[PDB]
Design a protein that fits this description.
Chain lengths: 548, 558
């Protein structure tokens, strides 16, 4: 170590290495593949920021405190100046230029030295496999799984020395324990006070919304950002608050994910109070009746459903133009937090019995493998989605079991190679076979009497083996005539964007709602030509004088 | 020490930097990173030319001024000097020595000299690595978006130790507002006289037109260049353009993006009434079927006629080749001059489920270098929801999520669908008739075996005529006029007879081919039957080229 003597264990005896806790389940491998006779070079494999400092860089802090195995006793973990003394000339060629000046001393150390990571996918490595081929070079490495799998293929100058330490992220609870012995380094630097419910908000609340940093990475900087917002709050040029809270954490978490505090700082039971009120921000209503299917997802938190099944299993029977599109998205707006959780698939594609392998997947060798399926690849894309199966009844009169493995054993296998998991889904089936009769009255006090003629008539294309695996046959509440006047004004919003741009007032007194009461609630045809009760008598002659 | 570096706060102890207005939240973000214990280095990421320098310029006038928090008092922020590194080399490898002596002495400062590295994408810079956590170096970055992914985010070493302060395209009013208090050095330097609206018509009229540039960089590059065409008469020997005007800012904008001055002097309702009488010179007719084709632009780009709809797929009757699919080849004249808009689909007899896997590697070769364009689709007539399932949300919503996923800015690009089924059950003959055959077949021409809800969802139920009987050598006059003034020099002129003009102008009508029997019934006179007496030895002038009364093949004797 003639040029320099950069020592990791000296940084442990001075305390410049950060105080480390936990992570002893995977020091019991790092050492077991380190103090061996052969294969003496561990590589910590995971996501970038999992705890590669938490294992390797605390081992030097573990040497001087004596809880390391014997054989490792009297071993100093060293490092190089790799990052400033890889080079020494002006032009290119400095990838491994002055490596030989500082690798020759390591042979003389006689089984004591351990060289650091130094980002060993960047050492590529013109001199490393010359240096490592004898095995006397005693090291630790660490590289992420994108830079461990893509990096090397069959190097027996590398995999001869490396052991597959696939390091993993801790759970929700574990990273909370890390911040208890890490708040002793933030009581001196930011000069703040950190409390115990303040450190739980960094872990368990960012667990559902934040995934770009692993569990003891995102929970540490979320703590230290509020601790770096303290003197931004105290000393913005009366407001001295060095005691941090969970509100400081939930502040900077709301500014990071994109979603505000409004759907974040509550328990799931606390947004459950206005769940129907956020349902009926866009649902046509009938809140005295249709809260049964509201209770079914409310029954999905305790866990008395089948664990070998998805979250939901239903039937969504009724007319069209009623909530076939409206009710399904609003189930995804609350739990699944999205407007693109929609897998609308009309099952009129089953005019051939060969079309089982098109929504699911062709076999290997047959055409339809390079793109996969429809009810699989979207669920491969979105495993956190509701699933909506439009018009089930047009399945083949001989061929089914397209929807039985998804409900019985919960899982489904496409023709690609990997089984698709449906455990975080809810099935929504619209097999309209006998409920296309909205023209009858049937809806003054009860709305199930429309359904009672269907269960005697729907079962010739259904089977007894299928209706068992769906619990609540939830009938579509109808679209009344007065109920159009709540949900028809959300189409007008582009002209609502237009009317404030021109300084004019064309706001009505009973002149434009009589044609908005002619969309839906149909006796003969439907809402597809009923949408044209507006364009041919208002939009042509009244607002063509607005661009002139 | 004393002279090896340039302390920008030593320029800010007197006040030789730039103030910050409106960007105060991203400068409270800079201290919000640097106050940390772990990973306490900021990076001022912006677009090309947003003021990534300006934040440290704003940070410099807060340290001595005391508007920073109480922990940055005394810590004076420097900058990475480039000229104090490579000046006066003597032998080979003069980089690492007069970088380290500038570097190593900052160990005992204890966070005092906080370095700023402008152009972190350049700073190479690979000796500043191993001592971030030493306290011997404390850096501040300034990078562009793509220029950060190549240098820090590709690796895991610097991935921790630098945080990204994203700086955006500011508002137009705050763009002028920082130049509203810093206007003194703009009055006597650009050779411009003081007026209010001089910045205005280059900032409000160039955030969308030249949106491929950056307005905070066009916060100088449109003041320095619109007042550079002004500089022809500012000192050359009221009377002339001494003050800035803002019509010549609009006039020089036409010399940048190609959108000329004939749009920037007309009114608003005439600006959208120029496409109407446009495709009438080359493609003749269509005196209403171009008035009511961009009518939905007055009804969807503004938004009038119930935008929860497709555009329309009723009849557009046409002749085979010369006004069926040609009406997107003559559209190189409208808004962005995009000839690479070629997405046209025949969607006529597609009944099998195996014709979709070609549209879903050239997607990032033609549309992403120039995003604001025209995008076409025509002849979408008879398909099933096996292929219409993608194309059911392409009727609206703008942004494409099939395999695209990103912002597909089709509200500022165009989405068009038409169906131009003019093949059977009614046709032209040659190109001259009246207007008594406009709209007569609803379930007969396009909607042969498909639902009427696909033919009542059309806004612009418009068409041109099934003209006929006299004119296919005149709509395709390209092989009559242009090919027979071919020898316009050497004293030559090719005159055609009435046999090839009015005799056969009606006879060999076939409703399938059209353009090739024009070149098959008149395939016997063009060059070498013309060259029976014209070419190869008889090039003497003094005679007139003519054709005579013969049968359908003529030897053109002179
Ligand atoms: N168990 C732990 N004890 C102390 N600090 C930890 C622990 N786990 C993680 N950290 C902190 O999180 C960071 C982990 O760094 P690391 O995971 O090695 O990043 P990378 O994988 O990008 O090299 C370090 O700053 C470290 O201080
Ligand atoms: N509840 C609603 N809110 C807004 N628009 C609606 C609603 N119901 C129907 N529409 C409009 O009516 C048109 C035709 O609806 P339709 O396809 O018949 O509905 P569904 O698929 O539910 O039967 C759609 O383009 C849509 O814009
Ligand atoms: N919003 C703004 N208002 C006024 N001036 C600005 C603004 N943004 C940038 N500038 C000017 O641009 C300069 C910043 O240069 P910049 O484009 O950030 O350089 P670089 O791209 O090399 O980092 C400042 O000196 C300032 O004068």
């Amino acid at each position: 170590l003639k040029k320099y003597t950069i020592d990791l264990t000296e940084r442990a005896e001075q305390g410049k290495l950060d105080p480390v806790i936990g992570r002893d389940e995977e020091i019991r491998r790092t050492i077991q593949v380190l103090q061996r006779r052969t294969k003496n070079n561990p590589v910590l494999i995971g996501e970038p920021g999992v705890g590669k400092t938490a294992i390797v860089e605390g081992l030097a802090q573990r040497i001087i405190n004596g809880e390391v195995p014997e054989g490792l006793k009297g071993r100093r973990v060293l490092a190089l100046d790799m990052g400033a003394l890889v080079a020494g000339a002006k032009y290119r060629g400095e990838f491994e230029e002055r490596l030989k000046g500082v690798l020759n001393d390591l042979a003389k150390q006689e089984g004591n030295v351990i060289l650091f990571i130094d980002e060993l996918h960047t050492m590529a490595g013109n001199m490393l496999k010359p240096a490592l081929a004898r095995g006397e070079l005693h090291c630790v490495g660490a590289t992420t799984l994108d830079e461990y799998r893509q990096y090397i293929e069959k190097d027996a100058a590398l995999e001869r020395r490396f052991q597959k330490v696939f390091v993993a992220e801790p759970s929700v609870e574990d990273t909370i324990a890390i911040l208890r012995g890490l708040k002793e380094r933030y009581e001196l630097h930011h000069h703040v006070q950190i409390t115990d419910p303040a450190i739980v908000a960094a872990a368990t609340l960012s667990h559902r919304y934040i995934a770009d940093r692993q569990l003891p990475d995102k929970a540490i900087d979320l703590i230290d950002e509020a601790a770096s917002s303290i003197r931004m709050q105290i000393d913005s040029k009366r407001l001295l608050r060095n005691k941090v809270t969970d509100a400081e954490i939930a502040e900077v978490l709301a500014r990071w994910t994109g979603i505000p505090v409004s759907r974040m700082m509550e328990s799931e039971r606390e947004k459950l109070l206005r769940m129907e009120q956020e349902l009926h921000h866009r649902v046509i209503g009938q809140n005295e009746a249709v809260d049964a299917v509201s209770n079914a997802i409310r029954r999905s938190r305790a866990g008395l459903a089948d664990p070998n099944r998805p979250i939901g299993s239903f039937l969504f029977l009724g007319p069209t133009g009623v909530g076939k599109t409206e009710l399904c998205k609003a189930l995804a707006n609350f739990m699944f937090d999205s407007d693109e959780a929609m897998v609308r698939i009309d099952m009129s594609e089953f005019m051939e019995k060969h079309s089982v392998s098109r929504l699911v997947g062709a076999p290997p060798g047959y055409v339809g493998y390079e793109e996969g399926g429809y009810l699989t690849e979207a669920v491969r894309r979105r495993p956190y989605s509701v699933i909506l199966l439009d018009e089930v009844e047009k399945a083949h009169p001989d061929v089914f079991n397209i929807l039985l493995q998804v409900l019985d054993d919960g899982r489904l296998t496409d023709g690609q190679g990997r089984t698709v998991d449906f455990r975080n889904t809810v099935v929504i089936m619209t097999s309209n076979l006998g409920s296309d009769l909205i023209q009858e009255r049937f809806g003054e006090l009860d709305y199930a009497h429309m359904k009672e003629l269907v269960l005697g008539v729907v079962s010739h294309n259904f089977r007894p083996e299928f209706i068992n695996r769906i619990d609540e046959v939830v009938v579509f509440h109808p679209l009344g005539e007065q109920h159009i006047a709540s949900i028809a004004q959300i189409q007008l919003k582009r002209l609502y964007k237009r009317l404030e741009e021109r300084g004019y007032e064309i706001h009505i007194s009973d002149e434009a709602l009589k044609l908005l009461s002619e969309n839906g609630y149909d006796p003969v045809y439907g809402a597809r030509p009923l949408k044209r009760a507006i364009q041919q008598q208002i939009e042509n002659p009244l607002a063509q004088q607005i661009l002139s």
